[PDB]
Amino acid sequence: IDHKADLAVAPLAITYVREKVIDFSKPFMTLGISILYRKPNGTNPGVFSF
Amino acid sequence: GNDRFEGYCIDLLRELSTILGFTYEIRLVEDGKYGAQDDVNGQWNGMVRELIDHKADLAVAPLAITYVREKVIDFSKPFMTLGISILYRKPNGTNPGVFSF
Amino acid sequence: LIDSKGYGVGTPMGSPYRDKITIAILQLQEEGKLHMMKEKWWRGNGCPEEE
Amino acid sequence: LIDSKGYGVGTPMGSPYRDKITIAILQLQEEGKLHMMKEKWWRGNGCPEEE
Ligand SMILES: CCCCCCCC/C=C/CCCCCCCC(=O)O[C@@H](COC(=O)CCCCCCCCCCCCCCC)COP(=O)([O-])OCC[N+](C)(C)C
Ligand SMILES: CCCCCCCC/C=C\CCCCCCCC(=O)O[C@@H](COC(=O)CCCCCCCCCCCCCCC)COP(=O)([O-])OCC[N+](C)(C)C
Ligand SMILES: O=S1(=O)NCN(C2CC2)c2ccc(F)cc21
Ligand SMILES: O=S1(=O)NCN(C2CC2)c2ccc(F)cc21
Ligand SMILES: C=C(C)[C@H]1CN[C@H](C(=O)O)[C@H]1CC(=O)O
Ligand SMILES: *[C@@H]1O[C@H](CO)[C@@H](O)[C@H](O)[C@H]1NC(C)=O
């Protein structure tokens, strides 16, 4: 905003409130919010499955 | 009027209307087409063309963001996300019979 | 997907509505409106299984 | 994905480097350089232990 730089080449995600103060280029990468979680370890009980 | 039409990009144009207020009128493109340079002339065709000589103001339609379309007209930031992909037939139902053993 | 592209309400070269529409697309995307409309039209009728 | 939104080279409000990178980002994409650079970094040891 205060012109201390010229570009912002970074992972700077396009948000509604960021577009109203600075102006972005058109996206060089697509994403969305998504949940990260530990891959579950161990297996099902399965005393059957004969 | 504006009641002949329905779709995603008519629902989008109504939702952009209640935010801004620019009350619109649909004049669909006549020589139905999107945009291409004819490679000998260099002239555009269809909805890229009718925005060049200011005949209409918007292009609310599946007008993809192409490198050659951006130099000429001004696209907004996207509202969907495309990709080129292949439409082929699903294979036959193999149908294992009751006497398959 | 072979490439990635996207749509856009196309405006003439140097039109003022390049900015006033992308404010109202980014607003309709965080309010979930651009996913309620995609779901309302691309709902289809369903395909049975991918077994 | 919960929403869908994207990255972008941020420019000050009024800077002409907005439109000169707008065409430039589209230039690397149809040539396949944006896919080539992303392939080079987001691919690593694939965790192939599924089999
Ligand atoms: C073909 C050659 C042999 C034929 C011989 C005779 C055949 C006659 C019939 C034999 C079997 C009788 C019907 C079985 C129905 C079970 C259905 C099922 O799939 O499981 C369901 C319910 O399963 C249960 O959890 C409880 C089922 C009954 C428990 C005792 C087994 C009966 C064996 C009788 C002893 C023989 C006595 C009679 C003869 C002396 C689903 O649950 P699950 O899947 O189990 O969940 C665990 C697995 N998992 C965690 C990974 C999900
Ligand atoms: C009862 C005696 C009678 C005399 C006969 C003697 C003959 C000899 C017969 C057998 C000799 C050997 C038997 C030992 C087998 C069990 C092995 C074990 O301990 O570990 C297992 C115990 O899981 C079980 O299998 C429980 C067995 C209990 C038996 C009684 C249940 C039914 C009772 C009657 C029912 C109602 C009756 C109504 C009738 C209609 C657990 O293993 P784990 O390491 O923890 O792995 C967990 C797996 N997981 C992590 C994936 C989850
Ligand atoms: O045509 S764009 O503005 N720029 C190119 N890209 C990303 C590089 C994949 C994308 C990705 C998704 C879009 F909706 C638009 C575009
Ligand atoms: O934040 S954006 O510029 N506009 C909103 N969208 C589409 C509505 C998903 C997208 C989709 C993919 C992008 F890379 C960017 C955007
Ligand atoms: C690492 C940080 C703080 C960055 C990464 N990109 C997000 C952004 O572009 O705002 C930020 C937050 C996140 O990871 O959710
Ligand atoms: C099976 O495949 C043939 C050609 O591959 C096609 O003509 C036929 O309609 C298919 N039958 C189905 C999909 O039931």
Coordinates of C-alpha atoms and ligand atoms in Angstrom, one line a residue:
Chain A
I1 CA 0.0 0.0 0.0
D2 CA 2.6 2.5 1.1
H3 CA 4.7 1.9 -2.1
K4 CA 7.8 0.6 -0.2
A5 CA 7.9 -2.1 -2.9
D6 CA 6.7 -2.7 -6.4
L7 CA 5.7 -6.4 -6.4
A8 CA 4.6 -9.1 -3.9
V9 CA 5.8 -12.3 -5.6
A10 CA 4.9 -14.7 -2.9
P11 CA 2.2 -17.2 -1.8
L12 CA -0.2 -14.3 -1.3
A13 CA -3.7 -15.8 -1.7
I14 CA -6.4 -13.6 -3.3
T15 CA -8.8 -12.5 -0.6
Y16 CA -11.8 -10.1 -0.8
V17 CA -10.2 -7.6 1.6
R18 CA -6.7 -7.8 0.0
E19 CA -8.1 -7.0 -3.4
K20 CA -9.7 -3.8 -2.1
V21 CA -6.4 -2.3 -1.0
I22 CA -3.8 -3.8 -3.4
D23 CA -4.4 -5.2 -6.9
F24 CA -3.4 -8.7 -7.7
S25 CA -2.4 -10.3 -11.0
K26 CA -4.2 -13.3 -12.3
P27 CA -3.5 -16.6 -10.5
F28 CA -0.3 -18.5 -11.2
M29 CA -1.5 -21.4 -8.9
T30 CA -4.9 -22.7 -7.8
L31 CA -5.8 -24.0 -4.3
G32 CA -8.4 -24.1 -1.6
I33 CA -8.5 -24.5 2.2
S34 CA -8.2 -28.2 3.1
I35 CA -7.6 -30.3 6.2
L36 CA -4.3 -31.9 7.0
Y37 CA -4.3 -34.8 9.4
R38 CA -2.2 -37.8 10.4
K39 CA -2.6 -40.9 8.2
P40 CA -4.2 -43.5 10.5
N41 CA -1.8 -46.3 11.6
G42 CA -2.8 -49.9 12.3
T43 CA -5.6 -51.9 10.6
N44 CA -9.3 -52.9 11.3
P45 CA -10.0 -55.6 13.9
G46 CA -11.4 -58.2 11.5
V47 CA -11.4 -61.3 13.6
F48 CA -13.8 -62.5 10.9
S49 CA -13.2 -62.0 7.1
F50 CA -12.8 -65.7 6.6
Chain B
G1 CA -36.4 -9.3 -22.4
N2 CA -34.2 -10.8 -19.7
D3 CA -36.7 -13.6 -19.0
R4 CA -36.0 -15.8 -22.0
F5 CA -32.8 -17.0 -20.5
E6 CA -31.7 -19.2 -17.5
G7 CA -28.5 -20.8 -16.5
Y8 CA -25.4 -20.5 -14.3
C9 CA -24.3 -17.3 -16.2
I10 CA -27.8 -15.8 -15.8
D11 CA -27.8 -16.6 -12.1
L12 CA -24.3 -15.0 -12.0
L13 CA -25.5 -11.9 -13.8
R14 CA -28.4 -11.5 -11.4
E15 CA -26.0 -11.8 -8.4
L16 CA -23.6 -9.3 -9.9
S17 CA -26.6 -7.0 -10.3
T18 CA -27.8 -7.0 -6.7
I19 CA -24.2 -6.1 -5.6
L20 CA -23.5 -3.4 -8.1
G21 CA -26.7 -2.2 -9.7
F22 CA -26.3 -1.9 -13.5
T23 CA -29.6 -3.3 -14.7
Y24 CA -28.8 -5.3 -17.8
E25 CA -30.3 -6.4 -21.1
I26 CA -29.4 -9.6 -22.9
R27 CA -28.4 -9.3 -26.5
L28 CA -26.9 -12.7 -27.4
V29 CA -24.1 -12.8 -29.9
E30 CA -25.5 -13.2 -33.4
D31 CA -22.7 -14.9 -35.4
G32 CA -22.4 -17.3 -32.5
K33 CA -18.7 -17.6 -31.7
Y34 CA -16.2 -16.8 -28.9
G35 CA -13.0 -15.4 -30.4
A36 CA -10.3 -16.3 -32.9
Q37 CA -7.8 -14.5 -35.1
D38 CA -8.5 -15.6 -38.7
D39 CA -4.7 -15.9 -39.2
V40 CA -4.7 -13.9 -42.5
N41 CA -6.7 -10.9 -41.5
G42 CA -6.2 -10.7 -37.7
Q43 CA -9.8 -9.8 -36.9
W44 CA -11.7 -11.3 -34.0
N45 CA -15.1 -13.0 -34.1
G46 CA -18.1 -13.1 -31.9
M47 CA -18.0 -12.0 -28.2
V48 CA -14.3 -11.0 -28.3
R49 CA -15.2 -8.9 -31.4
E50 CA -18.3 -7.2 -30.0
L51 CA -16.3 -6.0 -27.0
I52 CA -13.6 -4.5 -29.2
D53 CA -15.9 -2.1 -31.1
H54 CA -17.8 -1.3 -27.8
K55 CA -21.2 -2.7 -28.9
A56 CA -21.8 -4.4 -25.6
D57 CA -20.2 -4.1 -22.2
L58 CA -19.8 -7.5 -20.7
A59 CA -19.2 -11.1 -21.7
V60 CA -21.1 -13.2 -19.2
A61 CA -20.5 -16.6 -20.8
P62 CA -17.9 -19.4 -20.8
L63 CA -15.2 -17.1 -22.3
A64 CA -12.0 -18.9 -21.2
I65 CA -8.9 -16.9 -20.2
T66 CA -6.6 -17.4 -23.2
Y67 CA -3.3 -15.7 -23.7
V68 CA -4.4 -14.2 -27.0
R69 CA -7.7 -13.0 -25.6
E70 CA -6.2 -11.2 -22.7
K71 CA -4.0 -8.9 -24.9
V72 CA -7.1 -7.6 -26.6
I73 CA -9.9 -7.4 -24.0
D74 CA -9.9 -7.2 -20.2
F75 CA -11.0 -10.3 -18.4
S76 CA -12.0 -10.2 -14.7
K77 CA -10.7 -12.6 -12.2
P78 CA -12.1 -16.1 -12.8
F79 CA -15.4 -17.5 -11.6
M80 CA -14.8 -21.2 -12.5
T81 CA -11.8 -23.3 -13.1
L82 CA -11.5 -25.2 -16.4
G83 CA -9.1 -27.8 -17.8
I84 CA -8.9 -29.5 -21.2
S85 CA -9.8 -33.2 -20.7
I86 CA -11.0 -36.1 -22.8
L87 CA -14.7 -37.2 -23.1
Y88 CA -14.7 -40.9 -24.2
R89 CA -17.3 -43.7 -23.8
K90 CA -17.5 -45.7 -20.6
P91 CA -16.7 -49.4 -21.5
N92 CA -19.4 -52.1 -21.8
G93 CA -20.9 -53.9 -18.8
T94 CA -19.0 -57.1 -18.8
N95 CA -22.0 -59.0 -17.2
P96 CA -20.6 -62.2 -15.6
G97 CA -23.5 -64.6 -16.0
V98 CA -25.2 -66.8 -13.4
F99 CA -23.4 -69.8 -15.0
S100 CA -20.0 -68.2 -14.6
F101 CA -18.5 -71.1 -12.8
Chain C
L1 CA -6.6 -31.9 -16.6
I2 CA -4.2 -31.1 -19.4
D3 CA -4.0 -27.4 -18.5
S4 CA -5.6 -25.0 -16.1
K5 CA -7.7 -22.0 -17.2
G6 CA -10.8 -20.2 -16.0
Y7 CA -13.7 -18.1 -17.0
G8 CA -14.3 -14.4 -16.6
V9 CA -16.8 -11.7 -17.2
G10 CA -15.0 -10.1 -20.2
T11 CA -14.9 -6.3 -20.4
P12 CA -13.5 -4.1 -23.2
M13 CA -9.9 -2.9 -23.1
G14 CA -9.6 -0.3 -20.3
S15 CA -13.2 -0.7 -19.1
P16 CA -13.8 0.5 -15.5
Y17 CA -15.8 -2.7 -14.8
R18 CA -12.7 -4.9 -14.7
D19 CA -12.4 -3.9 -11.1
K20 CA -16.0 -3.5 -9.9
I21 CA -16.8 -7.1 -11.0
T22 CA -13.8 -8.9 -9.5
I23 CA -14.8 -7.3 -6.2
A24 CA -18.2 -8.9 -6.7
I25 CA -16.8 -12.2 -7.8
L26 CA -14.4 -12.5 -4.8
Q27 CA -17.3 -11.4 -2.6
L28 CA -19.6 -14.1 -4.0
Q29 CA -16.9 -16.7 -3.7
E30 CA -16.4 -16.3 0.1
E31 CA -20.1 -16.2 0.7
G32 CA -20.4 -19.6 -0.9
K33 CA -22.6 -18.2 -3.7
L34 CA -20.4 -19.4 -6.5
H35 CA -20.6 -22.9 -5.2
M36 CA -24.3 -22.9 -4.5
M37 CA -24.9 -22.0 -8.1
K38 CA -22.5 -24.6 -9.5
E39 CA -24.2 -27.2 -7.4
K40 CA -27.7 -26.1 -8.4
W41 CA -26.9 -26.5 -12.1
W42 CA -24.2 -29.3 -12.3
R43 CA -26.2 -31.6 -10.0
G44 CA -27.2 -33.9 -12.9
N45 CA -29.2 -37.0 -12.1
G46 CA -26.4 -39.1 -10.7
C47 CA -24.5 -42.1 -12.0
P48 CA -24.9 -45.5 -10.2
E49 CA -21.5 -46.8 -9.2
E50 CA -17.8 -46.9 -9.8
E51 CA -18.0 -50.2 -8.2
Chain D
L1 CA -11.3 -28.4 -0.9
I2 CA -13.4 -26.1 1.2
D3 CA -13.2 -23.0 -1.0
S4 CA -11.3 -22.3 -4.2
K5 CA -8.9 -19.3 -4.4
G6 CA -5.5 -18.7 -6.0
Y7 CA -2.2 -17.0 -5.7
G8 CA -1.0 -13.9 -7.4
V9 CA 1.7 -11.3 -7.8
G10 CA 0.5 -8.4 -5.8
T11 CA 0.8 -4.9 -7.2
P12 CA 0.0 -1.5 -5.5
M13 CA -3.5 -0.1 -6.3
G14 CA -2.8 1.6 -9.6
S15 CA 0.5 0.1 -10.7
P16 CA 0.8 -0.8 -14.4
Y17 CA 2.8 -4.0 -13.5
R18 CA -0.6 -5.6 -12.8
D19 CA -1.4 -5.9 -16.5
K20 CA 2.1 -6.7 -17.7
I21 CA 2.4 -9.7 -15.5
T22 CA -1.3 -10.7 -16.2
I23 CA -0.3 -11.4 -19.8
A24 CA 3.1 -12.8 -18.6
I25 CA 1.6 -15.4 -16.3
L26 CA -0.6 -16.5 -19.1
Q27 CA 2.5 -16.8 -21.3
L28 CA 4.3 -19.4 -19.2
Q29 CA 1.1 -21.4 -18.8
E30 CA 0.2 -22.2 -22.4
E31 CA 3.9 -23.0 -23.0
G32 CA 3.8 -25.3 -20.0
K33 CA 6.4 -23.6 -17.8
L34 CA 4.0 -23.1 -14.8
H35 CA 3.4 -26.9 -14.9
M36 CA 7.1 -27.6 -15.3
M37 CA 8.2 -25.6 -12.3
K38 CA 5.4 -27.0 -10.1
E39 CA 6.4 -30.5 -11.2
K40 CA 10.0 -29.9 -10.2
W41 CA 9.3 -28.9 -6.6
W42 CA 6.0 -30.5 -5.4
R43 CA 7.2 -33.9 -6.6
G44 CA 9.6 -35.8 -4.3
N45 CA 9.8 -39.2 -2.6
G46 CA 6.2 -40.2 -3.3
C47 CA 5.4 -42.3 -0.2
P48 CA 4.8 -45.3 -2.5
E49 CA 4.3 -47.8 0.3
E50 CA 0.6 -48.5 -0.6
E51 CA 1.3 -51.8 -2.4
Ligands
LIG1 C1 -18.7 -72.2 2.1 C2 -17.9 -73.4 2.8 C3 -18.3 -73.4 4.3 C4 -19.8 -73.7 4.5 C5 -20.1 -74.3 5.9 C6 -21.4 -73.9 6.6 C7 -21.9 -72.5 6.2 C8 -23.2 -72.1 7.0 C9 -23.1 -70.6 7.4 C10 -22.0 -70.1 8.0 C11 -22.0 -68.6 8.3 C12 -23.4 -68.2 8.8 C13 -23.8 -66.8 8.2 C14 -22.7 -65.8 8.2 C15 -23.3 -64.3 8.0 C16 -22.2 -63.2 8.3 C17 -22.3 -62.1 7.2 C18 -21.0 -61.3 7.1 O1 -20.4 -61.2 6.1 O2 -20.5 -60.6 8.3 C19 -21.4 -59.6 8.8 C20 -21.8 -60.0 10.2 O3 -20.9 -61.0 10.7 C21 -20.7 -61.0 12.1 O4 -20.0 -60.3 12.6 C22 -21.5 -62.1 12.9 C23 -21.8 -63.3 12.0 C24 -22.1 -64.6 12.8 C25 -21.0 -64.9 13.9 C26 -20.7 -66.4 13.9 C27 -20.3 -66.9 12.4 C28 -21.3 -68.1 12.0 C29 -20.5 -69.4 11.6 C30 -21.3 -70.6 11.9 C31 -20.4 -71.8 12.2 C32 -20.8 -73.1 11.3 C33 -22.0 -73.8 12.0 C34 -22.9 -74.5 11.0 C35 -22.2 -75.7 10.3 C36 -21.6 -76.7 11.3 C37 -20.7 -58.3 8.8 O5 -19.8 -58.2 9.9 P1 -18.3 -58.7 9.7 O6 -17.9 -58.7 8.3 O7 -18.1 -60.1 10.3 O8 -17.3 -57.7 10.6 C38 -15.9 -58.0 10.9 C39 -15.0 -57.9 9.6 N1 -14.5 -56.5 9.3 C40 -14.1 -55.8 10.6 C41 -13.2 -56.4 8.5 C42 -15.5 -55.7 8.6
LIG2 C1 -14.2 -71.4 26.3 C2 -13.5 -72.8 26.6 C3 -14.6 -73.9 26.5 C4 -13.9 -75.3 26.6 C5 -13.4 -75.8 25.1 C6 -11.9 -75.8 25.0 C7 -11.5 -76.0 23.5 C8 -10.2 -75.1 23.1 C9 -10.7 -73.9 22.2 C10 -9.8 -72.9 21.9 C11 -8.3 -73.0 22.5 C12 -7.6 -71.7 22.2 C13 -8.5 -70.4 22.3 C14 -7.6 -69.1 22.3 C15 -8.0 -68.2 21.1 C16 -8.0 -66.7 21.4 C17 -6.7 -66.0 21.1 C18 -6.5 -64.8 22.1 O1 -6.5 -64.9 23.2 O2 -6.2 -63.5 21.5 C19 -7.3 -62.9 20.9 C20 -8.6 -62.9 21.7 O3 -9.7 -63.0 20.8 C21 -10.5 -64.1 20.9 O4 -10.4 -64.9 20.0 C22 -11.4 -64.4 22.1 C23 -11.6 -65.9 22.4 C24 -12.4 -66.1 23.7 C25 -13.2 -67.5 23.7 C26 -14.6 -67.3 24.3 C27 -15.5 -66.5 23.4 C28 -16.9 -67.1 23.2 C29 -17.5 -67.7 24.5 C30 -18.9 -68.4 24.3 C31 -19.8 -67.5 23.3 C32 -21.3 -67.7 23.7 C33 -21.7 -69.2 23.9 C34 -23.2 -69.4 23.4 C35 -23.3 -70.6 22.4 C36 -24.4 -70.3 21.3 C37 -6.9 -61.4 20.7 O5 -5.8 -61.3 19.9 P1 -4.9 -59.9 19.8 O6 -3.4 -60.2 19.9 O7 -5.4 -59.0 20.9 O8 -5.2 -59.2 18.4 C38 -6.3 -58.2 18.3 C39 -6.6 -58.0 16.8 N1 -6.7 -56.5 16.5 C40 -5.6 -55.6 17.0 C41 -6.6 -56.4 15.0 C42 -8.0 -56.1 17.0
LIG3 O1 -5.7 -18.3 -16.7 S1 -5.4 -18.0 -15.3 O2 -5.8 -16.7 -14.8 N1 -3.8 -18.2 -15.1 C1 -3.5 -19.6 -15.2 N2 -4.0 -20.3 -14.1 C2 -3.1 -21.0 -13.2 C3 -1.7 -21.4 -13.8 C4 -2.8 -22.4 -13.6 C5 -5.3 -20.2 -13.8 C6 -5.9 -21.2 -13.0 C7 -7.3 -21.1 -12.7 C8 -8.0 -20.1 -13.2 F1 -9.3 -20.0 -12.9 C9 -7.5 -19.1 -14.0 C10 -6.1 -19.2 -14.3
LIG4 O1 -10.2 -16.0 -6.3 S1 -10.3 -16.1 -7.7 O2 -9.5 -15.2 -8.5 N1 -11.8 -16.0 -8.1 C1 -12.6 -17.1 -7.6 N2 -12.2 -18.4 -8.2 C2 -13.2 -19.3 -8.7 C3 -14.5 -19.3 -8.0 C4 -13.6 -20.4 -7.8 C5 -10.9 -18.7 -8.4 C6 -10.5 -20.0 -8.9 C7 -9.2 -20.3 -9.0 C8 -8.2 -19.3 -8.8 F1 -6.9 -19.7 -9.0 C9 -8.5 -18.1 -8.4 C10 -9.8 -17.7 -8.2
LIG5 C1 2.4 -19.6 5.9 C2 1.5 -18.7 5.9 C3 1.2 -17.8 7.0 C4 0.7 -18.4 4.6 C5 0.7 -19.5 3.5 N1 -0.3 -18.9 2.6 C6 -1.4 -18.3 3.3 C7 -1.8 -17.0 2.7 O1 -1.5 -16.9 1.5 O2 -2.3 -16.2 3.4 C8 -0.8 -18.2 4.8 C9 -1.6 -19.0 5.8 C10 -2.0 -20.5 5.7 O3 -1.1 -21.3 5.5 O4 -3.2 -20.7 5.9
LIG6 C1 -21.0 -51.8 -25.9 O1 -19.9 -51.3 -26.7 C2 -20.3 -51.1 -28.1 C3 -19.1 -50.7 -28.9 O2 -17.9 -50.8 -28.1 C4 -21.5 -50.1 -28.2 O3 -21.9 -50.1 -29.6 C5 -22.6 -50.6 -27.3 O4 -23.6 -49.6 -27.3 C6 -22.1 -50.8 -25.9 N1 -23.2 -51.3 -25.1 C7 -23.6 -50.7 -23.9 C8 -22.8 -49.5 -23.5 O5 -24.5 -51.1 -23.2

